[PDB]
Amino acid sequence: AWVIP
Amino acid sequence: AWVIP
Amino acid sequence: ADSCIQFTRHASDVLLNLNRLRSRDILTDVVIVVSREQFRAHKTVLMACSGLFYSIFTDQLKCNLSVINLDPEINPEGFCILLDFMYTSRLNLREGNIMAVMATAMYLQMEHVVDTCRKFIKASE
Amino acid sequence: ADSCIQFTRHASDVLLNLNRLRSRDILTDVVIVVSREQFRAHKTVLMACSGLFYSIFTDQLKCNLSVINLDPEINPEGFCILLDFMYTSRLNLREGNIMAVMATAMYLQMEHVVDTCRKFIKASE
Ligand SMILES: CN(Cc1ccc2c(c1)OCO2)c1nc2c(cnn2C(C)(C)C)c(=O)[nH]1
Ligand SMILES: CN(Cc1ccc2c(c1)OCO2)c1nc2c(cnn2C(C)(C)C)c(=O)[nH]1
Ligand SMILES: [Cl-]
Ligand SMILES: [Cl-]
Structure with missing residues (x-):
């Protein structure tokens, strides 16, 4: 996997 | 985009 | 074949176009009632x-x-x-919304969402 | 919202599962005849x-x-x-197969495939 898009 | 996977 | 080339953005472009079809109600074939x-x-x-x-x-x-x-x-x-x-x-x-999202992801069997919800909850405790 | 988190592999995992449905002939709804x-x-x-x-x-x-x-x-x-x-x-x-793939991509209006075919053809000339 999860990220800040 | 195009790459060698 | 092992000689293929790959278009990196293809999968995300497909998903973006599926979401555009959903927004316009094109070829939708089920209604989920909650x-x-x-x-x-x-x-x-x-x-x-x-x-x-x-x-x-x-x-x-x-x-x-x-x-x-x-x-x-x-x-x-x-x-x-x-x-x-x-x-x-x-x-x-x-x-x-995290508790509702986690409960819904457990019911829908969406393990990656359940995982990030568990991680965010644990970080707040 | 601008506060979303994103699961990087989601779009490719969706496409992989759509291809698995196609291989098993699950919910396919059209036959293309060539x-x-x-x-x-x-x-x-x-x-x-x-x-x-x-x-x-x-x-x-x-x-x-x-x-x-x-x-x-x-x-x-x-x-x-x-x-x-x-x-x-x-x-x-x-x-x-490149000439057949390029002609088919032009007909199907798949511009990214047409582009890589043009590039591979130009490199051989
Ligand atoms: C694959 N195609 C792109 C495309 C390329 C050339 C064309 C075209 C559409 O129609 C005529 O010539 C596409 N576009 C979509 C979809 C949903 N919305 N949209 C747009 C038109 C709003 C971008 C979709 O499912 N697929
Ligand atoms: C989303 N789901 C994964 C999944 C998770 C928990 C489950 C499950 C399936 O069934 C029962 O519990 C999925 N799997 C697919 C598809 C196609 N083939 N497959 C597998 C089973 C061969 C991997 C598909 O479209 N979706
Ligand atoms: Cl998930
Ligand atoms: Cl394309």
Whole structure:
């Protein structure tokens, strides 16, 4: 996997 | 985009 | 073949176009009912994201249904957030919705969402 | 919301599961006929990848057809290679098939494939 898009 | 996977 | 080339952005471009079809209600083939709320979607996208929808739409009788009613304990906003995630890869996880999103992801059998919810909850304790 | 988190692998995992549904012939809803060959697929994936299929399946009469016959000049192997690309992001481009793949991609209105074919042809001249 999860990220800040 | 195009790459060698 | 092992000699293929790959277009990196293809999968995300496909998902973006599936979400555009959903917004315009093009070729949607099922309505998911969550208490008083109705959500139109494509069965194949639901199956590709959710263990529960995969089981439902591979059943020889349920595969033909145009309406699916979820358990009354499922929160419509939680379901809406998960349906948007299915079609965009983006999860609108907030303090005010995390418990509903996690419960809905457990019911829909969406393990990656359950995992990030568990991690965010554990970080606040 | 601008506060979303994103699961990087989601779009490719969805596409991989759509291709698994296609292999098992689950919820396929159209047969594409290319001369003597038939290919089963999901209309939404075809629309999400191809300008031609988008135009076909948004037409009020053609959206209801369960069989679509392509122009007899289209090469079945070229179409097969492009259908596999739609469902996997991988294009099996070879010296022996590049002209057929490029012609099929022009017909299907798949500009990124047309672009890489033009680049590979220009490099050989
Ligand atoms: C989303 N789901 C994964 C999943 C998770 C938990 C489950 C489950 C399936 O069924 C019961 O519990 C999925 N799997 C698919 C699809 C196609 N093939 N497959 C497998 C089963 C061969 C991997 C598909 O469309 N979706
Ligand atoms: C694959 N196709 C792009 C495309 C390329 C050339 C064309 C075309 C469409 O129609 C005529 O010539 C596509 N576009 C979509 C979809 C949903 N919305 N949209 C747009 C038109 C709003 C961008 C979709 O599923 N697929
Ligand atoms: Cl998930
Ligand atoms: Cl393309």
